[PDB]
Symmetry: D2
Subunit: 471 residues, 4 copies
């Protein structure tokens, strides 16, 4: 079965009974809750349906809260949706209005004040493009230069305009709070522009008394300019290609994607590739050849996880989207799990030990690699190496199981907090022997550490035959 992980975004199309359950059954490893949409009630209900389906099927499902950040947006249209055709004049106003085809609000109140004739305005990640002709008091008068359909509250991007807005708005802070309290496993922050942005997420987490891993979404040039610092200061990154493809030239995105994946794997941080991977399946039961390709090449790039957005959130074929993405990933993986090699020899204890664990298990044809982890680190350092062998993480902290749902190749087992490595090893046998997949005598390679229950104590590798007296 599949090694590459699948993130799905929840929405209107997953709101009906036991759709969430079908998604998990079809392979969803992480549920994304997008805080740009929905009411708190909708997010509670969805969260609850994910815990039910995860617990009831036995499959790990991480819940990731996506914070809107400083996303600039349109207001409402009287019709909910209009066509912006090439040649038309449109006003985007910071004043209040009855929104119509000709005149629509925006949430960015400095827009009239900061826009300059010549500026370009991409709507909805480029389904429409406009050029600013003038600013008349509150209105930015523009010409539609590339036409297309626009609708309520779609995003706008103003490439190069250097936008003033908090890294976390009042709304983001409250959504973060509600999400921490509800119990989510990870938090993603939109529009990261600095490694220091994670500090602000941590400040809130600490007031509230609870931290989880933070994912930087990469969709700003400033973020790509600071890629390594951001990969080091955050716990994960998402290549957020929708907005990245209008914040930067769309032609630069594929190499940015590839670099950012490599940078994540170099430093053992999960990385998610997001947005329009199967875009056409919003309306169609099968994807284009470019989509299938895009997904396969994200696998070969070495991405831990691929994400579906509108394909599951508002689309007509959410389940098929998930199964399809799963089939393409598996097709690549049946061929090879190899990823671009790392450009350094590991230097950290946990990196050096995990690297060696992998060598041992592959050279002996072990049935599995097994690694004990309290924070996930030791397992992340092995996962990044890719390996055809099962990579089975063991932990006593259930949150780590949900967190590891976004890490390549990794299934997790929860066991009691043990006071010794012999104890860790007995638990391995006990857990695996209750599975079909393992029987007594099977060869496994186990990484563990003492002093027990201490992050970063990893210090042993143990070649072990299940149940046999080799400890």
């Amino acid at each position: 079965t599949r090694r590459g992980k699948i993130v799905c975004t929840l929405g209107p199309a997953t709101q009906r009974d036991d759709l969430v359950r079908a998604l998990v059954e079809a392979g969803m490893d992480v549920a994304r809750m997008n805080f740009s949409h929905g009411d708190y009630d909708d997010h509670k209900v969805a969260y609850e349906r994910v815990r039910v389906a995860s617990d009831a099927t036995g499959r790990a499902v991480g819940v990731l809260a996506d914070l809107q950040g400083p996303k600039i947006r349109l207001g409402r249209f009287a019709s909910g949706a209009t066509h912006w055709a090439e040649g038309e004049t449109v006003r985007i106003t910071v004043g209040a209005c009855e929104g119509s085809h000709d005149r629509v609000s925006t949430t960015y109140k400095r827009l009239a004040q900061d826009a300059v004739a010549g500026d370009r305005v991409l709507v909805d990640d480029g389904k429409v493009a406009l050029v600013v002709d003038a600013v008349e008091g509150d209105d930015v008068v523009c010409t539609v230069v590339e036409g297309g359909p626009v609708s309520d509250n779609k995003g706008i991007s103003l490439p190069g305009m250097n936008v003033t807005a908090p890294a976390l708005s009042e709304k983001d802070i409250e959504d973060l709070t509600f999400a921490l309290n509800l119990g989510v496993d990870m938090v993603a922050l939109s529009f990261v522009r600095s490694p220091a942005d994670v500090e602000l997420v941590h400040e809130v987490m600490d007031r509230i008394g609870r931290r989880v891993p933070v994912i930087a979404k990469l969709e700003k040039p400033e973020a790509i300019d600071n890629l390594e610092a951001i990969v080091l200061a955050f716990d994960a990154v998402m290549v957020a290609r929708g907005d990245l493809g209008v914040e930067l030239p769309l032609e630069e995105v594929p190499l940015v994607q590839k670099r950012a994946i490599q940078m994540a794997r170099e430093n053992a941080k999960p990385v998610i590739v997001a947005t329009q991977m199967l875009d056409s399946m919003i309306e169609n039961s099968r994807p284009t050849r470019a989509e299938a390709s895009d997904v396969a090449n994200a696998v070969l790039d070495g991405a831990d996880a691929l994400m579906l957005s509108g394909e599951t959130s508002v689309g007509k074929y959410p389940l098929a989207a998930v199964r399809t993405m799963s089939r393409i990933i598996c097709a690549v993986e049946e061929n090879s799990t190899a990823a671009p090699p790392l450009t350094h020899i590991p230097r950290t204890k946990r990196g050096v030990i995990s690297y060696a664990a992998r060598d041992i298990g592959e050279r002996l044809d072990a049935k599995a690699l097994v690694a004990f982890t309290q924070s996930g680190d030791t397992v992340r350092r092995l996962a990044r190496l890719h390996t055809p062998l099962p990579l089975l993480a063991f932990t006593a902290w259930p949150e780590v199981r949900s967190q590891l749902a976004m890490t390549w190749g990794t299934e997790t087992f929860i066991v009691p907090k043990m006071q010794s490595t012999d104890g860790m090893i007995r638990q391995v046998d006990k857990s695996l022997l209750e599975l079909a997949r393992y029987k007594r005598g099977d060869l496994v390679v186990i990484v563990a550490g003492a002093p027990p229950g201490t992050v970063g104590s990893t210090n042993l590798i143990h070649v072990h035959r299940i149940g046999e007296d080799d400890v």
Copy 2:
């Protein structure tokens, strides 16, 4: 500037004024004429517009004739189009019919005789899928299992059914004849299933007294099963992903593509990657992130050429399709031109000499690599290596200039047939000095051969300073 080549298909959207000329101006290196559509008059006119624009701009443009081959298709509907929705019952008949929503003819007259309940029918490369429920005399009664809009003469594919059809129908043979006579530079054959299929193309070519390079289109499992023999028996291959993605699981296409590109470059045969690379630009001014990716990864795969089909033939943004594809290719190339390495040391004289020419020019920081070729082979063996250096082919046969339009990184110069290699070298200087860009004293590396005017005589490398007396 750009190395990877761009094929565009002509059609209704380019029959409008000055468009062919704009396509060439925007970068089209090969024009595809698809013999599944059009009147012979349409193809004459289009051919003519390509020669005008090529000659008037100075840019080489190969004209490639695409033969329909044994493509199975629907007949006509009595509105020209219908919607096939999920749940509906459709009859596909080999009899005579009123074509309508409920019942439509097919060109494959063995269909009732070859179909079995359970067979799948993918229409229009999978925008609709049906399952055969029964065969009643002439009619194949099916249920729509994935719905979508259908129209006149859309192609159908029947995975699992064994289709009987000639490699070349009598229509194909007449189209081939007309195309040879009109003067096209290359010929592509659809649905190749055997290395022996090229013999049948050659049989006709010889009756008529004129051969050109033949491209195998790869869109049948039998073709992938015989990939190496087909790459060796034909002069080039096109990864034809539209049909390949319904003739095989669509999830297997991206790895088939990667292997087929490698197999082409191993044996120095041009390879084209085709179909839905920028699919959404049929209706939109900008592509998805998957499309951009797909195009970039075809570059990194090492494809000589990428093709646009509906994006230029019937679409709304033909020019933007071409410029966009050009921008993404250039973006990848500005980073690196490197391609997957070859899995052998070259053994043929022309391969060994071309390989060394490349080494010399790069290690001396020469301004350009120049190779004399009569058949194109010598240049193809260098092109496959990729190299950041200009790769300038010289020939006395204009056909070879058009043919080399589909080969990576290659600009061609036509010069007189010379009777010595010194003469070949003076012609190099003459031709390059007619450029603004090139000046006396510049370092170039020139490959040539004697006895002169003999295919495969390639046997010299000469490091030469333009206009200096070093010969």
Copy 3:
């Protein structure tokens, strides 16, 4: 310290008081007792002096018994010695006689029956050469082709001739018996030709009730033709270049040496390079440039041990020979310990684990690698890799400490027979902390295995800080 080990041969020049002690003090790691010379008393007394000096200094010293084997020899001459001049006719007869200048016996009773006109006869490793002219009944009539002095019982070789003889003569068997009883740590067999020869050595070992490691001496073509089988059937090999260089053309020896060392390391068997490495120091206090080179290149070849023969057995500068050999080895090793890489990935548990242990220790800058071994195998698989880090073997079998004295880079510590791996690790700390060299908190990598006391149970790696609570 030095890593490459030094074998020394005992003889007249080491018989005097406290010389054996000075040899050990200067670095002797193995003492060779050559059973071609001396009476049993001589070997008793020598063995005794080696145990005293080893035990009193704390340096491991293996004692190796070298068995003469089916060495072919001359008989006796009436005057004990004659000069054979170039041009003279000499008979070597299988008839019994007290010899003379014209006619001398040989111990090889099939000589007249097996020799053919044309054969060459090299005496005493080639200081005199004859050509066989004829065989007349019992006498092999020869012409002296290269002159020199001969004496009683000097060895003769007939390159290319097929010798029929047991692997062990009755003298060898009795010497083996006396050597086993006296307590030697290893046994070398001269003139091995077959992997089956070790069976006969084992048959005797078993009659007597004692086995030790057996070294095949490589000094016969048959042995080089069967190099892998012999390396696999024996426990070690010695490149015995003196006889090898007359049994084969002397010009073939250096490559044979290099191959045989590689084949030993590939299969984790110790290998000794023997004979004339410092030949001139028999008479001089400093060696030639060729000698120094020869020694350095034996190190770079990857030899576990280098041997001195006449340089310590009969020479005038035995101590200087040993220190000089030590200074050259150290000089090469101070530069780099790197060795020709192995031509396979290790596949045995002990090899895979030892290889990984090495990776871990070097990548974490461990102070030492430690491996527990019961037969030495696990340590031999690490030793062959070379590593600049101390490689400290731990064992409960003292004989293994003596045996490991011929294995590269390896210092051995004897500890109690332990009943658990925790127990193994506490012993490590205890032993190392009794050195000035090691302190609490020092980082080591320990290889061990359970069940305890089981050959090949090796299955754990443990990164451990001396005395800290990390077990």
Copy 4:
């Protein structure tokens, strides 16, 4: 047949009749004349015998003049000799005297001023060692620490001591003058310490109106400290191990040898390995195993030439020394001609083109590589790569044929100075067809250059079939 070249030293043992001719016939590629011994008449006669034998046999033989340089020496003793025994007190004085056991002169007049208590004094490359106890006015009072016989004018070395003396003495200047006039092909300078030393050799060469290649002998620490500068400023280097092994610790020489050979090959300068390679053949008909090894490992190190000194100059088996050295070199080469790879990609035209020429020839199984050279450079850049294929140099300057006799793998043909490259190629065929080895249709790769007869103009590679019309 042999690729590695053999230098021999001439002396008393080759002054006997027809010996020089036998030496050349047995393989001598360069004759060394050592100007520390012999009178000018002796060197005239020897030079003459070499030209006769070279010209009469058709084998190239370079003549190398070895200049004594600022060698420090003892004066004369009353008896022509003394025995210096261990424990005794000896004075070496800078005063003039007919010496005795107690007190003998030295040619180094700053010795009392530059020696300090503790310094070592090694005589005759270390047959005797003394330690400086004190300096009293002119006398350096020492204790003999390693005893032996000394005689008139023996060389002494003072490891570490910082010596002031001109690079060339008055005697060296006159020997250089006589050697230039007599017609030698190259000159070696002893005890080079600086890149600037070659300037003073050039100053004399220019006064006299004749330059030849200069070899730096490497036998001083200062020379190893400046190894690159010296390799670049001189035309060749000799690893002069006799003095190098007393000027430095003898144990450091093997690594110095290896890196000096590497540094020569990196910069395309010939390198000679000298002294005691076959030392014991001075007295014996067959060498030790260490010697054979030393010779083989000089080949594997990548040395262009190996040198015999006393083995041919004063020894009893000069011919056997030469044949034996030839047999060992061939034995290594039959195995592989490989040399340690270069640590850079070549950057000079001649290096890049020679490197490519070799690729082409090996990949096509060309019968030979042929390179035209006016100074030898182009051929030296190919020779350093080693190649199993014949490397045939073509030149119009006969002195270059003698000079190339010390470059690896290279046989030279003299031809007319031609005024075109076509003319160069016809000459190739004509010359080679007169050999047994070549026939019409044989495949060769020819390097040449225009303008013709201009050093460094190398700029063409031509694959050519002998006698065929392919130019």
